[PDB]
Every structure is written in C-alpha cells, then in structure tokens.
Design an enzyme around this catalytic site. Structure first.
Site, PDB file in Angstrom:
ATOM      1  N   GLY B  10       0.810  -1.194   0.000  1.00 28.94           N
ATOM      2  CA  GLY B  10       0.000   0.000   0.000  1.00 28.94           C
ATOM      3  C   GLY B  10       0.853   1.256   0.000  1.00 28.94           C
ATOM      4  O   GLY B  10       2.045   1.236   0.295  1.00 28.94           O
ATOM      5  N   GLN B  15       5.368   4.605   1.631  1.00 26.99           N
ATOM      6  CA  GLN B  15       5.807   5.969   1.879  1.00 26.99           C
ATOM      7  C   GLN B  15       6.306   6.132   3.306  1.00 26.99           C
ATOM      8  O   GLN B  15       7.301   6.825   3.533  1.00 26.99           O
ATOM      9  N   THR B 171      -9.582  11.369   4.222  1.00 32.98           N
ATOM     10  CA  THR B 171      -9.541  11.845   2.841  1.00 32.98           C
ATOM     11  C   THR B 171     -10.607  11.169   1.980  1.00 32.98           C
ATOM     12  O   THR B 171     -11.356  11.842   1.269  1.00 32.98           O
ATOM     13  N   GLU B 175     -13.660   5.046   3.065  1.00 32.55           N
ATOM     14  CA  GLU B 175     -12.818   4.597   4.178  1.00 32.55           C
ATOM     15  C   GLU B 175     -13.552   4.012   5.384  1.00 32.55           C
ATOM     16  O   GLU B 175     -12.923   3.251   6.134  1.00 32.55           O
ATOM     17  N   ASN B 198      -3.800  10.253  11.594  1.00 34.27           N
ATOM     18  CA  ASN B 198      -2.996  11.258  10.919  1.00 34.27           C
ATOM     19  C   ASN B 198      -3.124  12.629  11.564  1.00 34.27           C
ATOM     20  O   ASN B 198      -2.204  13.449  11.461  1.00 34.27           O
ATOM     21  N   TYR B 216       4.109  15.550   4.572  1.00 39.71           N
ATOM     22  CA  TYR B 216       4.154  14.152   4.963  1.00 39.71           C
ATOM     23  C   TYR B 216       5.551  13.689   5.328  1.00 39.71           C
ATOM     24  O   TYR B 216       5.688  12.612   5.913  1.00 39.71           O
ATOM     25  N   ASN B 220       6.016  11.178   8.540  1.00 46.80           N
ATOM     26  CA  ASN B 220       6.547   9.827   8.415  1.00 46.80           C
ATOM     27  C   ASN B 220       7.684   9.598   9.398  1.00 46.80           C
ATOM     28  O   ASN B 220       7.838   8.493   9.929  1.00 46.80           O
ATOM     29  N   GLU B 246       8.677 -12.252  23.189  1.00 42.93           N
ATOM     30  CA  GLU B 246       7.990 -12.092  24.463  1.00 42.93           C
ATOM     31  C   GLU B 246       6.970 -10.966  24.452  1.00 42.93           C
ATOM     32  O   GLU B 246       6.166 -10.886  25.382  1.00 42.93           O
TER      33      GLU B 246
END
EC number: 3.6.5.-
Lengths: 146, 433, 424, 427, 145
Positions: B10, B15, B171, B175, B198, B216, B220, B246
């Site tokens: 994706g 990205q 956006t 979704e 976001n 962005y 990121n 663990e």
C-alpha cells in the site's frame, strides 16, 4: 567571473531538467544498445552515446545529454581564459577537461546512481549518469578557489 | 539470528517505509549507496561477500507511479533491484478489486520472494507489515497476505503498523468500508497491529515541536523513530534487553485484545530543549498526558490494562524505578484491578540518533511507551456508526457486488464488531464473585 | 503505462478537442513539428498514455477524428498543430447529415460505422494496457449527438471493461444556435445514461460569463473559450503523467465520486482565474482557492447549488505544496456548509495533489463536483421538448425514416425517471 | 548450385517478368552492360543460382521468351534492363492469338512447342543441380493459358518429382477485360489441378486498391503495378541464395503447404508497405511489421478472409532481428484468430528468416498464404462460365478447331469435385 | 589535419568494402596466376598485381590498386603537413616503403586467418596484409602528429 557563474547556473538548470528525465535517458540508451547489438559492454564514453544517437536511435534526451557535455567543455575553455590559475584550480580544470573529453573512459565513474538497479549501476550506465554532476561539482569548486 | 523481514504494501506502507531506512542506514556507519567504510546490522540486512548490505524489504502495490520514484531516487542502488514489485492497473480504493481481480495476478511471486528471503537467514522471529486501513491496496490486498504468512509459516510472530481513520480527518469517503472489511481478517491471523491516526501527529508537530506547516515528510519521520525503538535492543546491547517473541505474551491479555498505542515522549524542538532539561523523572511524565498520545482518544475515560517503557541512552536504572513508584500514587492515571504489577521497562546503552537536517534535537534519553487501554472502545464504535448510515441504504455497493461478491460479507461485519464490542464491556467490568 | 484513447466527433466536439493537443503537448514539451524540445526529464516518463512512439524520435497523438462532412476537418489540418496528426486518422464522409439525429445514427451512420471502428481496433488492441476512451461531443447538433450515440453502442460491447468518458456541451438555458436542439438532446440521453460510465457537462453560456466577470477580456473568441475547458480535462489526467504525494487515476476519481450507477453527470471548475488588472492584487495560496473554486461564479452548468445538495466533491491540486492547508480548509468548508451537503454521506470531499504545475504558473487546482441541482436542466430540456412535441412539429424528418410514434415517447418517459431520482 | 528456370507466355506475364529482372539486378548490383557492381561479397558466393556466369566478367540470365506475336517481346528490347537478355531465347512466330485458347493450345500449339522445349533441354542439363520452374502466365489468355497448361504438362514425362512455381494472374470474377475469358479460364483449371504444384494467385483488382490506399498513389500505371508482385517473389527465392538464421528452400515450402493433393493455392504479400507521407512518423520494427502482413486488406485477394480459414501459412523474413519476437508473434495470432485457423494443423505457420535486407530498407519480409477462401473465386468463374455455356454459345468454333461440347462438360464436373474440399472441412 | 583524417576515413570505408570481397580478390589472383603460368612464387608486389590485372575479377583488382594509390597519395599529404619528428618520419617512411610499387610484400603478415595455411605462407599472405598494416601506421602517424 560573473559570466562563467551565469554559464554554470544555466548548465545546472538544464541538468535539473535532464535529471527529471533520467529514466527516459536510460530507456533511450538501452534501445540504442539493442539496435547496435552492444548489450555486453558498459557505456564508457560521450562518443559512444553520440554514436548511439546518430546510428541506432529518445533522440531528444540524448541530444540534451550531448548539449550539456558540449556546454561543460566550452565552460572549461572559459575557465582557462580567465587566469593562469594555481596548482589547485589547474588540477580541478584538468579533471573537468578529461571527464568531458569525447573518448574518456567513464566505465568506473560513480557519483543519479541510486535510481539504477545494481546491475545497471555496475555494468551499464553508472559511468555516464555520474559524469554531469561530478563535473558540475569540480566547476563549483574551481569557481570557489578562483 | 534475531531477524525479521519488512513488507511495505500500500501507499501508506511504502511511503512510511520510505522514510524509515534513511534513519536505519544512518543508524550505523553504512553510507547509503550500499557499502560500509559490529554484527549489529544483520538483523535487518543480508550481507553479501562484496561488502554490500541488502535491506530486508519488499514493496508490493498495484500503482506504478509510487514505487518508481524509489527506483529513480537515491535508493535504487542500496536496494536489490527486483523486490521493487510494480503492477500496471489499479485497484484504486476498491476492497474487492485489490483482493479478487487485480492483486491475484501478483500474489504468487510476492510469496516466492518471501520464501526466498526467509530461507537465507535462519533466526526469523517476526514480520513488519507496513500498511493501513485507509485504501484498497493497503487493506484488501494485505488481508490475503496476513492469511498466507500464518497458515503456511506456522506460529511465527507477526507485527503490523496500520494507521486508523480519525473521526474528523479522512480523505476518502469509502474509508468506513475498507477498514471494517479488513478487520474480519486481522483478529484471527495476527498477533499485534498498532494504531495511529494522521490528525494527532500534526498537533504534536505544532505544540511540542516548533516547526509549523507539516508535510508528509516530517509526519513519516515520527513513526520512523518508533519502530526503531521497538527493535532497539535486537541490534544493540542493553542493561535490560527485550526481544520480540515475548512481546506477544505479556502485552496481550486476551485472544482478541491486542491493539496498543505508542508514545515517543521526548519529542522536542532544538530551541525548546535549551530552556528545559530532559531529566528522566520528567521524561516519563511526557507519556501520560492526553496531548502526546498518538491516537485521538481520551485516556481519562478508560482503564489501562498493561504498559511498557522502552528507554535508550544515559538512563541509570535507579531513576527509572524511583519514577516508576511515583506514577502509581497518582489518581489521574488509573489501572484495571486484574493487573497489580502493571508495568515493564527496558534500558539500553545507545543514544537515539536525530536525523541530520531534521526537526528534533540531540539528546541522550528517550522513551517509547507502548501500551494498551480501554480507550479504543469508543474509537471502534464510532466507525461502526459511519458504516451503518452508508449501509442503511446501500450507498457504494455497486463497486463491490458487481465484482462477483455477495452483500453477505457486509453482514458479517456487524456480526464482527458488535460481538467484538461487548468484550470491552463484559470483561471490562468490576470484580464480581 | 495505462493508455487512454482520445476521440473527437462532431463539429461541437471536434473543435473543443482540437484545442487539447496544443495545450497538453505544451504541458509535456512537444513542438509544432512533433519532436521533443522540453527542459525536464520527468515530462516524458509517462508520455505513452496519449501517444504512440514513431521512428526517428517523433511522437504522435492518438486522436481518431471522425465526422460526416469534410468541411470541419480541413480547418483542423490548417490549424497550428495540424501537421502532427497521423493522416490515416482523418476519416470523413461526403454527404451531410446536417443537424439531424436520424441521419447521424441511422441514415449516414449505418455506412461509415465500419470504416471507423476498424481504426478503433487498429489503435486499441495494438497498445499494451488500455485505461480509457475520452470522447468529446455534445447534445447540440445532429451529428455529434447522433454519431456519438451510435459509436459508443459498440465500444461498450466489444470493449465492455474499459471506462467510457463521454463529454457534453449541454445547450444554454436562454437560447442556443439551433431550433430543433431539444430533439438533438433528449434523443442523445435516451442511450447515454444506461450505457456510458461517467459524463462531463459543459455550459456554453458560462463559457462567456467567466471571461467578462473574472478575466475582464474585451474579445471573447472561441480560440480562447476552449482554452479554459482544455485546462480542466487535462487536469483529471495530471497524476497519470506526473507524480505526487497523493495521486489520482481516472477511475479512482470515478469509484469514489459516483454514488449510484445511473447518476454520473459532472460539473467542471478551475481555481486560478485572474483578471488582467487583478494580476498584481492577488495572493497565491490555498485560501485563495477554496473560496474561488466553491463559488457559483466558477461552476460550469445551469444549476442552483443554493437550491440543491452536493453529493460528492473532488479537488485536484497541483504544484509542490504543503497539504495540512488542504486538509484543514476542506474540513472547514465541509463543516460550514452543512446544508449544502447531503447527510447520509459522512465525509464528502476527496483531495489530490500533484508536484509539477502548469507552465510558468506557481500552482493551480481543478474541480469536478457532483450536484443535485442539475435536475431542473433535465426538467426544462424535457419541458421545452414537450412544447415542440405536443403539436408533432418538426416530425417532418423522423417520421420519414419510418421511425414509429413509440420511439419519441420513450425518451420523454425515461427523462421523467431520471429527474424523479435526483429528487431521491 | 540449385539453379532455377524462368519462362513466360501471355501479355502480362511476359511483362511482369520484364519487371523481375530489373529487381534482381538491383539486389545483386548489375549494370545495364551486364557488369557486376554490387557492394557486398556475401551475394557473389551465390550469383550462379539465377544468373549464368559469362566469360569476361559479364553475367547473363537464363529466362526463355516464347509467344506468337513480336510486339510484346519487342517492348523488352526497348526496355531499360532488356539489354542483358540472351538473344536466341527470343523465339517469336507470326500468327495471331485472338485471345483464343483454341489456337494457343490445339490448333497452332503443335508447331513451336517442339521448337522451344529443346532449348529448355539445352539449358536444363547445363546447370549443376536443377531446382524448379517459373512459368509466368495470365490465366485464361490466348497466349496466356494457350501455352501455359500445355508446356508444363508435356514436361512431366521427363521430370516427375521436381518443384514448380507459376504466377497466375487470376481473373478476379467481379469484371473482366475479355468476353471469351471464362472459356479461356476453365480449361486451364481442367488440366492444372492434377499436375500443378504452387500457383501464385495475382489479382489486379486487389492491387488497384492497395496501391490506392495503403500506398496512396496518384497515377498507378502498369510500369509500377507489376512491381508489387515483382518484388514479392524475390523474397521466396532469397533463402536459396542468401544465408539466414533458419533458412528455407522451395521444397521446404511444398511439404509445409500441400496437405491434400488438390489444395495448393497461394496469396502473396510484401511487408513494409507505407505511403511516402507517413514514413518518418513511423518506426520500422518487428511488432509493427507483423501487423501489416496479417491485415485482411493487405493480402492480394478479391475476397474476404473471414469466411475462409487458413490451412498452412508461410512467411519469409529478411534483415537482422531476434526470433522469439517471431516465435511469440507466431503464437499470438493462433490464440486470438482461433476461428480463422483450422483446428487440424498443429503448428499453423511456417516461419523462415534471413540475414540481408533489401536495398533502401533495414529489414523486410514476404507473406505467402493458403486459405479456405479461394473457392469463392473458383465457384464464380464457373458461374460466369456456365451462364455463357448453358445457352450453348461459341461451340462451333472450337468444334471447327476440334474441341467438342463433350470436353466442356467435365470442366464444371471436376470443379464440382475440386471446390467441394474447401467447403467440406469447414466443420 | 582535418582533410587527412577525412581522406583516411574514406580509404578505411573503401577497404571495408574490399575486405568483404577478400575471397573474390584471392580467386581473381589465382586465375591470373594460372593464365600467367606463375603458380610457384608468392605474389610479392603491387606491381605484380597490376601486371596480372593488365595482361568481376578485374573490378576487385582495380579496387585493390585504387586503395594502394590513395594510400600513396595520403603519404604525400602527410609529408606536406609538417617536417615531423623521428617518430612520425619513421612511420611515414614505413608507409611509403610498403605502398611502393616494387616493394617486397612476401614476408608481410597482418585477413590472414581467412586464408589456408598454404595460401597465407606461400601465395597471398603478403598482399592481403598490406592495406590493414599501412592503415594502422597512418592512424599511429595521425595520433603522434
């Protein structure tokens, strides 16, 4: 001095437009090598890119590479005319003149290389894509010393 | 040895994972073309005899324009040149088409490269799937991959980083669909899948971080310094080490409740650090205010059911356990009563590295507080309501039922989330005898 | 990589498509010769979506020009870019249809259908991975409403997978340049709605309006009035040929935007539109877009958004830029105009960003917006059609082909159904 | 080393072959004086195949001219490359053909045929190892089929097992330029089918159209209309004399395209046909050369190939390429046009290549096709014959020449049998 | 300098066309030796090739003679360009000696691999080696000049 800085900035602007088309330049070279039956050897010189463009060619992006190399070679002549230089500026200028010479071997030259696969970077195009940015750095360094 | 593989699938994966490897290659002395001018790197690197290291990565998507600039960037030379998998035609935010029409032409060569990478190095212990719930190729395509890697590789652990749609910032319109269609596959074939939105990344980039107008790139970079901190002691020495196997036995109470947060608490601007020192007792207090929680939920409405405290740097183990006992006294941070011990720490000998040309400041201390909560109960139930009012008159069903798949899988979502909402109320109650 | 094939049919559709290939090419750098003389490298790497490579380092567009009269194309050869077309693409007839739907679909369309669909197959199956079919026509005259209806009746059957992108210059509300254009329009939409994928709607009166109010030009010429509709249709495609942080395909803008299968009619728009005086008085950032794009002065149809509710809204940005401004402004315009948007759709607006702007311009935008305010257009077109039909006036030609009385009552019956389902 | 034999009779076939020897000279580099001036030495190793070597450095052909009129022959000595031709081949009589098959074959046909066959026999044994025949006839002419089906029928008691090529300009049943032509036509197919091996069906009607559209000419005249069949057949007879990468001979072709004894009929073709206006816009490469050859308006039929599936296909390439281009581009056209190739051939196309391009190009090819579509040409010539014949017209002439009404009965009777087999295997 | 490089490139293009016809050149020489009854000795000079030609085969012998004539003229153009150095003058004198009509070529060996061992040793190895060796010395001369 001002004129050679303006010439260098003009070449850098053309090189930025060329660099945006680097994938088209590689595809152009690969198709010319296919038509030439010359897939075994690296592209080792400016003269080989010219021969590909003239006999086996894509043509617009090859012309843009040749035009930048021609302008870099002319800019070396303008640097030589500006002053007798120092050991440092003369060493930088001779490196520029050697690299932009038509028949100079580029096969080992590495700066643009990160956009190539490991095979393309090692065995095919890593030399030729590295030429312009390395010469531009030596010309900036030359100006900064001069 | 101590190794894992990273899969970027994706656009929200490839990205986000674009930005993680620059820190990772600058985590060590590896100049980013591929060479190195100390057996730490081999957890996420497969070293070749020439001296070149190979990043453990694969990049699978159906769009060509997002993988290609990596192939023309500066990391075409660091990476091996054909795990950059690239399709032609797009699913384009359709759940049924990245999973049943277009993604299926590329699946059998992805798992081939999965088998090819896994069978070189011996000590696999986990996987790092980079994805989200926000598209089609990050959601529906991965929902087949998470049931390939589980039934075929047995009981290997597997870890995901998936962002979550905020109640106000989303956006895409569909979704609400491709999130809840993804979650039918998540609970049965995973171990963890961390959450972020976001929106709340932006607020920390305004308040605690000075630099305004966030692209962005800087967003990121914050998740890049978090997945470094989960894997910080696998590659480095530590006073108190944490492995990755663990994490699945002590962060996870129940067979469905495995959805925790993260909090990289020392995030601070270059001049904000100069008028406030970063001592450890005020480091760990930056975890627990609602401003620095990475998901837009209020911690004061829920009960914590575990915690973790992954430190780095110049942390003596005497300040931490003293600062452990002071937070137990407070009442604004409350815990559920079937966990009297609660807490968990890890200390390490290395300083965290700030990205050069970056927007954080050089320190010698850090905390990555990964913990779960009751606070995600409401965040789940709100997106069931956005799913309901679109399915109340079957709005966008003609891009799904026309792809050869029944409406009945939209019914199994309401079987899913309602039966997975009463658990946060059934076993989230008082002590009853 | 994912090519789409571009057609222009009928003198309305030919002329507005005739202007595209000069503006799109200067968005890539192709000279009037056909050669490449650009500046950047990024403006060739996705060139094949509108192009076929040719020997010698020349590219060529993929326009398949079709008409029924030879008068229209001989100007198009004589135009500025008339020498970069493949001369086998010019296909045309000799006897005029002459503003008739009967001639464009039955009489003179039954003969030159096969000499054009062979050129359709000769460009389609000979290129790698198809993605679309851009056809420029309208409902105005008789050819471009009749021949384009006949043409797409087969394109959706021998190629039933791909995305049909038909275009329409819908007639003006006050008057238009035909006296039988209700008949040219309501016959077109009888077969448009059930068969295409998504349709654009362009208003020609609002071509004139937005050059006097906003661009203040004193000479509005059709050379300039198509230069603005070329800027919008080249925008839906600006992420196929340029990268960006969040890029948009054509179908990606179609699966999100279209709510219901039979309601696929759009409304273009375009944000930077500055008068020659107001050049030096305007700032270029995102709050000068969301007010200049969302207003009724910039939309391109005879609608009343104050009387209607937007279903979905798309906004493709362009230029390297910082997109919290895109997020938080279009949060607010969603939250201000709560009665301008429908309520069963929770979130409405889809954002898209590019990285390379129009040439010499800092930044731009492009609007494609669905609305429930266009039903009165289909009410008034189907009302003034029923004014002409009630006395059987201008049935002099359609009865003469042998078409029954039952033909022309079905288009009116199904234009009752569409306008009853914008109310839905 | 495999020399080969060329003849002609008729009007057109005596002039199409007068455009052949101009083409092969330019492939080889031969001046009008007979002096060789080619560039590469790779052709000189096989100059003996068509041309006879002559003393002094000159090179001489071996074609034989025979017809009953002097005029069409005397055009060749007026020609540009009619000066290298051998002078004792020109055997010319005095009488008039009249477009009559009755006088080309039975009436006058006893006399000069015995005087021309022994000059072929004066050239057949002269060569090293003979290969085959090129008899260039108009189908159904006075000197066209009067001397065509006669001459090779009397050969066969000397050469039973030898290859044969003929360039039969087929009548193209839409319209014809002779009122007695179906009478001249159906007696050619009477005596060929038990004997003939590979005929090249040449339509002038198709070549009126493809010089009009896929070439876009303004005045197509017979000095250039013969060219497009003149350069076509040189590609077949190139792999004999030029090296290749998978080389071919004419007997390699005959095994490939004669499944039954009766079904051996061909449609020719030539690959890089593009107008002068759109040459620079176009790129000459393999995946677009393959699209020209397989266009249904490109091969030389006055018929549509839609109803007619193809038994076996051959294609001879020239120039330097790669072959998994061609090996796949073979395999593709079976997959999509699967109802256009019969199921009862496993490998539907023979693909042959070479190494040397023609002059003026980088690469080329040549298309050679065999169908189940030519029976509509074969039925309709009989249909315009039997309309002329059921009314018993023109019978006393041939009876005065000897030919009864009995003979014309078997012609449709055997073409009842022959045209059935293109139709029988349509299921 | 530019003119002599263009002349050399023109001679190299003619020599490439001649080299493609090397088997025809050998067959031409063998038939001339048969007619001369001179099969015993190697072909040792340009003058002997001329005598054979004078007393298709004729065309390839003319092409050899024309190339040798153009090489000899190119030596005169090199002499006119400058007084030279010991290196360029040694290279030029080697070229002039080799393209002299009566110079013995019998021992000259570069084209030789296309000959049988007998033809290469005893008949034609000298004459086929002439042009490529002279072209190399002329390239070397230009590179020094």
């Amino acid at each position: 001095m001002n004129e050679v800085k303006e010439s260098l900035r003009s070449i850098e602007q053309k090189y930025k437009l060329f660099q945006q088309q680097q994938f088209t330049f590689i595809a152009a070279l690969e198709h010319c090598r296919e038509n030439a039956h010359d897939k075994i050897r690296p592209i080792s010189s400016i003269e080989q890119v010219q021969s590909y463009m003239e006999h086996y060619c894509h043509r617009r992006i090859l012309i843009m590479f040749m035009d930048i190399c021609s302008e870099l070679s002319k800019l070396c002549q303008h640097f030589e005319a500006l002053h007798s230089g120092t050991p440092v500026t003369n060493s930088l200028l001779e490196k520029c003149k050697t690299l932009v010479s038509q028949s100079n071997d580029l096969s080992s030259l590495r700066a643009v290389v990160n956009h190539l696969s490991c095979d393309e970077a090692r065995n095919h195009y890593g030399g030729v894509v590295s030429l312009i940015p390395i010469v531009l750095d030596f010309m900036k360094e030359w100006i900064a010393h001069s | 040895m101590r190794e894992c593989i990273s899969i970027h699938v994706g656009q929200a994966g490839v990205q986000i994972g674009n930005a993680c490897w620059e820190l990772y290659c600058l985590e060590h002395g590896i100049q980013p073309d591929g060479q190195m001018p100390d057996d730490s790197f081999n957890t996420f690197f497969s070293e070749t005899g020439a001296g070149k290291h190979v990043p453990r990565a694969v990049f699978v998507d159906l769009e060509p324009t997002v993988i290609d600039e990596v192939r023309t960037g500066t990391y075409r030379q660091l990476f091996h040149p054909e795990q950059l998998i690239t399709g032609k035609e797009d699913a384009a935010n359709n759940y049924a088409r990245g999973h049943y029409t277009i993604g299926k032409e590329i699946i059998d060569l992805v798992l081939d490269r999965i088998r090819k990478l896994a069978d070189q190095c011996t000590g696999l212990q986990g996987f790092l799937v980079f994805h989200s719930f926000g598209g089609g190729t990050g959601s529906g395509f991965t929902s087949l991959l998470m049931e390939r890697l589980s039934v075929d590789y047995g009981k290997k652990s597997k870890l995901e980083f998936s962002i979550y749609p905020a109640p106000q910032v989303s956006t895409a319109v569909v979704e609400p669909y491709n999130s809840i269609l993804t979650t039918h596959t998540t609970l049965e074939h995973s171990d963890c899948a961390f959450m972020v939105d976001n929106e709340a990344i932006y607020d920390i980039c305004r308040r605690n971080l000075d630099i305004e107008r966030p692209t962005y790139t800087n967003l990121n970079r914050l998740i890049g310094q978090i997945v470094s901190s989960i894997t910080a002691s696998l590659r480095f020495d530590g006073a108190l080490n944490v492995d990755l196997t663990e994490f699945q036995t002590n962060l996870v109470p129940y067979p469905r409740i495995h959805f925790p947060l993260a909090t990289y608490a020392p995030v601070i601007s270059a001049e904000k650090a100069y008028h406030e020192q970063l001592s450890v007792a005020e480091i760990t207090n930056a975890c627990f205010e609602p401003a620095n929680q990475m998901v837009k939920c209020d911690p004061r409405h829920g009960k914590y059911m575990a915690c973790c405290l992954l430190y780095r740097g110049d942390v003596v183990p005497k300040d931490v356990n003293a600062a452990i006992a002071t937070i137990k006294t407070k009442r604004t941070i409350q815990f559920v009563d079937w966990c009297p011990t609660g807490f968990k720490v890890g200390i390490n000998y290395q300083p965290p590295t700030v990205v050069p040309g970056g927007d954080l400041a050089k320190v010698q201390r850090a905390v990555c507080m990964l913990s779960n909560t009751t606070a995600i109960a409401e965040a789940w139930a709100r997106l069931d309501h956005k799913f309901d009012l679109m399915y109340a008159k079957r709005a966008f069903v003609h891009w799904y039922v026309g792809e050869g798949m029944e409406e009945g899988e939209f019914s199994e979502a309401r079987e899913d989330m309602a039966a997975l909402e009463k658990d946060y109320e059934e076993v989230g109650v008082d002590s009853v005898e | 990589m994912r090519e789409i094939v571009h057609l222009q049919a009928g003198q309305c559709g030919n002329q507005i498509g005739a202007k595209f290939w000069e503006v799109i090419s200067d968005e890539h750098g192709i000279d009037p010769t056909g050669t490449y003389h650009g500046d950047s490298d990024l403006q060739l790497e996705r060139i094949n979506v509108y192009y076929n490579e040719a020997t010698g380092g020349k590219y060529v567009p993929r326009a398949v020009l079709v008409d029924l009269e030879p008068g229209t194309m001989d100007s198009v050869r004589s135009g500025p870019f008339g020498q970069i077309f493949r001369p086998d693409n010019f296909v045309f007839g000799q006897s005029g249809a002459g503003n008739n739907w009967a001639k464009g679909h039955y009489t003179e369309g039954a003969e030159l259908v096969d000499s054009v669909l062979d050129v359709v197959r000769k460009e389609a199956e000979s290129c790698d991975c198809l993605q679309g079919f851009q056809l420029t026509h309208s409902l105005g005259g008789g050819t471009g409403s009749g021949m384009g209806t006949l043409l797409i009746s087969k394109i959706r059957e021998e190629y039933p997978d791909r995305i049909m992108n038909t275009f329409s210059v819908v007639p003006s509300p006050k008057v238009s340049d035909t006296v039988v254009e209700p008949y040219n329009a309501t016959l077109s939409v009888h077969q448009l709605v059930e068969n295409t994928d998504e349709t654009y709607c362009i208003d020609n009166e609002a071509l004139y309006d937005i050059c006097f109010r906003t661009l203040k030009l004193t000479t509005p010429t059709y050379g300039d009035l198509n230069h603005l509709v070329s800027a919008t249709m080249s925008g839906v495609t600006t992420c196929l040929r340029f990268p960006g942080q969040l890029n948009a395909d054509l179908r990606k803008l179609a699966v999100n935007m279209v709510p219901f299968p039979r309601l696929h009619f759009f409304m273009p728009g375009f944000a930077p539109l500055t008068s020659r005086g107001s050049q030096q008085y305007r700032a270029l950032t995102v709050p000068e877009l969301t007010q200049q794009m969302f207003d009724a002065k910039n939309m391109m149809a005879a609608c009343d958004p104050r009387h209607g509710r937007y279903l979905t809204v798309a906004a493709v940005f362009r230029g390297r830029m910082s997109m919290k401004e895109v997020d938080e402004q279009m949060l607010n315009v969603q939250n201000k105009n709560s009665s301008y948007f429908v309520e069963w759709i929770p979130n409405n607006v889809k954002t898209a960003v590019c990285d390379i702007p129009p040439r010499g311009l800092k930044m731009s935008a492009t609007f494609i917006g669905n609305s429930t305010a266009i039903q009165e257009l289909f009410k008034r077109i189907s009302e003034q059609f029923t004014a002409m039909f009630r006395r059987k006036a201008f049935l002099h030609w359609y009865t003469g082909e042998g078409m029954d009385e039952m033909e022309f009552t079905e288009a009116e019956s199904n234009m009752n159904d569409l306008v009853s389902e914008y109310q839905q």
